[PDB]
Amino acid sequence: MISLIAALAVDRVIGMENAMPWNLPADLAWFKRNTLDKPVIMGRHTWESIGRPLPGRKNIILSSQPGTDDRVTWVKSVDEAIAACGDVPEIMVIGGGRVYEQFLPKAQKLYLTHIDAEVEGDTHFPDYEPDDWESVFSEFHDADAQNSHSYCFEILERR
Numbered sequence: 001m002i003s004l005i006a007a008l009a010v011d012r013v014i015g016m017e018n019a020m021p022w023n024l025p026a027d028l029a030w031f032k033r034n035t036l037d038k039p040v041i042m043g044r045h046t047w048e049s050i051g052r053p054l055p056g057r058k059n060i061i062l063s064s065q066p067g068t069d070d071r072v073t074w075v076k077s078v079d080e081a082i083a084a085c086g087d088v089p090e091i092m093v094i095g096g097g098r099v100y101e102q103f104l105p106k107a108q109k110l111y112l113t114h115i116d117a118e119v120e121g122d123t124h125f126p127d128y129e130p131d132d133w134e135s136v137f138s139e140f141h142d143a144d145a146q147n148s149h150s151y152c153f154e155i156l157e158r159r
Contacts, residue, residue: 002106004093005034006125007113013121015096023148027113030153034111035092039085043099060084062099078102097123114152134159
């Protein structure tokens, strides 16, 4: 099964040109926990933004162009991305906006971090209908000395 993991602000914004104006170490912990030892699929832009492979995870990057880093696997289409993951229990799609849009229809679970921040962004998580999913886990957190804004973690399963 395919799952998407994403952190969204209001209006579903997930990215912009510059660094996001928030500091959320709790979300990073959540992201690690949920993707450890599982293959991760990401678009070229996301790859560039992270800059190194995620340790202890098979890294699959989608790009129409030839790959520039032999430490990861480069694929040219959605179908090849899936096939490069092999027979695994769960494939995690980590972004960006173009990638989420193509995998949403094939995903069975979403791992979302909702951040209470209003930011200007040019990339959004795709629109989804809450009715089609079942919220199986949800947990709100207030901002603190290490987290700049409040946020909520939610896990949804497709009905």
